[PDB]
Structure formats: structure tokens, C-alpha cells
Amino acid sequence: QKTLHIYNWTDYIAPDTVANFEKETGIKVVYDVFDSNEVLEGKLMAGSTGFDLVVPSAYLLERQLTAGVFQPLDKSKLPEWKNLDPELLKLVAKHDPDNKFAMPYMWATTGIGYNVDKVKAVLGENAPVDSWDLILKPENLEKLKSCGVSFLDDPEEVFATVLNYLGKDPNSTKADDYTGPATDLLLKLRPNIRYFHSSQYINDLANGDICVAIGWAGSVWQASNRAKEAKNGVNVSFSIPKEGAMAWFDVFAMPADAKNKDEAYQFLNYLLRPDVVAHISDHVFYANANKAATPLVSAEVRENPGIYPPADVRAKLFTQKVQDPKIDRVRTRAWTKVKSG
Ligand SMILES: [Cl-]
């Protein structure tokens, strides 16, 4: 009996990806899900996870390599590795030099999800939906307060977004930038923010309960697709704003103690087949990292520039740098202060 243990994000695979793999290979898959890097990180820190494959962000993977959590990938067992986009490989290699440990899976941005009709009702037909001004300018957010504003409960993404918007380094290593200007702006916005939460905004966008959110692109597009399938009249869109936004990459990696390594490599090379990961993107509305797969992605996903952004949009994106623990600690205390008001 061949077995394979996978730990992935929620809502991050097609319904039949596992079933098809089982039919093709005869391998029994045990598939478990998490919905935060914090849950994932806690299990990787405790070790003896029992997983053969896990899906960290490339950022988190960088933090764990020095701990020896992962083992290097034998690329000779991944003959379709050549299908991966070399530019995505280079971006992930900022966290994983020479792409030793991780296989790029999916990637997206942190932008603005919004209710088209409710935003235009409050701010007019020319509402600045192409700009972080839509939610980071206090006069705008005061007007959208009534239809509901959510921010991620994610200081790393929110502070980097605020710093970029203010003209600071999105990855500032200077503590005063977090405690001074970034906190000042967030404190001014905070009375207009209904909640800080990194998943309630998906259903709330889809049902019309909130009209603007900071959110992950594909999760906002899932909300939009849910509203369309429900025929409830709700029109959700997503903006990568003109000032730029954070891009991030989720990757497959193999825990150092993984028992089912041959099965794990079969699954990784299965994901490298163009139709497999194209079908996942079709269902979860995230861009995958496989350049061979792109033409196979449905046109409604492939041609969506908030999922597959073109060159002028990608040039404005920034990626997260790992900070000294001193900055981590400053961010955490400042975030506490912001949420409490
Ligand atoms: Cl990342």
C-alpha cells in the first residue's frame, strides 16, 4: 500500500485533483488543510509532522530552512520541472537560493476587493478603485464606513502596504517607520474599519455585507464567483492598485523526515503536468507558476489581469523581505496598538 500525506491551504486545489491522482497512480492520499501560516508554522516548529508535502509561503520557507525542516528536492525525479516559469523561479529563489527546497505552486497579490455598485454609490462613477487612495485616504474610508470596511489581520502585509503607499520602503528595516508614520495613518483609518480578519471578508464580500476589503486576489475572485453562482446581484471585483502591491508565492516543500518520498515526487511531477495545475487555477482563481500550463487555463482566468497581471502591473509589485526579529517584535506591538485604537 503506497500512501502520501499532504498539508495544504484550504480552497487551494481542484475538487478532483486528488481523486484523479489516485486513479492514475494507485497511491492513497491523505489530504489535510490549514487556513493560516501560523497554524502551519506551529506544526513545522514542533517537528514530526507526519506530512510528506506541505505548502508554505516562500517567505515562511525561508525562515525554516536554517532549522533543517525541509529536505532538498531531487529535480531528476521531476522531469517536467522545465515547465515552471523561470522568472517565478527567480523570485522564489530570493527565499530559496537555487530553488533547492521548494516547487512554486501558485502566486497572487494583496490588493483591494470591493463591491462595484456600493463603491460607486458612495464615491461616484469615478471612484478611485485603481488606487490605494480608495481605502487608505481617511476621507474616502469615512464615506465607505457605512457599507463596511475590512482589513486583513496581518501586520506584515498591512504595514508593508501602508509603507509603500506613504513613499517609504515597503520592507523598511527602520522601527520608527512602523511606530511613527505607518501607525499614525492606520490610527486615523481605524474608526472606519469594521474588523480585522483574514477570512471573514470572503463571504462578506460575496453576500454584500462589506463593500471594501484588503484581501488576497484569488480569495476575492472566489467571493466574486460565489456571488455570481448565487445570482444575488452582487458584483465583486479586485484591484491591484497603481501604487503597487505585495506579491507572494506559495510553494510545495518536503519535510526532512518524510517517509513517502517516491510518492511525494510522483505528486509533484503530476502537478507539473500542464493540464493538472491549469485545472486547479480554473477552480481556485489563482495563477499557477507553470508557464506551460498558462494557455490551458480558461480564458476567464488567464485573461484576468488581477490574476495573471501583465508586465506593467508586475513591475509595480514588491515582495516581502524577512526582517530581524527586532522588527518582527515592533510590528506585533504596533499592530496590537492599531487594532485597539
Ligand atoms: Cl511569499
Residue numbers in the entry: 29 to 369
What does the literature reporting this entry say, word for word?
Unfortunately, we were not able to crystallize F88A after numerous attempts, while high-resolution structures for both other variants were acquired. It seemed the removal of a whole benzene ring in F88A and keeping only a methyl group destabilized the protein by creating a large unoccupied space. To counteract the aforementioned difficulties, we constructed a variant bearing F88L instead of F88A. It acts as a substitute to evaluate whether the structural positioning of Y87 can be altered by removing F88. We obtained high-resolution datasets for this variant in a similar fashion as for the other constructs. To our surprise, all solved structures adopt a PotF/D-like semiclosed conformation. The same behavior is observed in the F88L variant where Leu tries to mimic Phe positioning. In F88L, Y87 remains flipped outside the distal region of the binding pocket. Tyr fills the unoccupied space between the salt bridge residues, interacts with R91 of the salt bridge, and stacks with Q348.
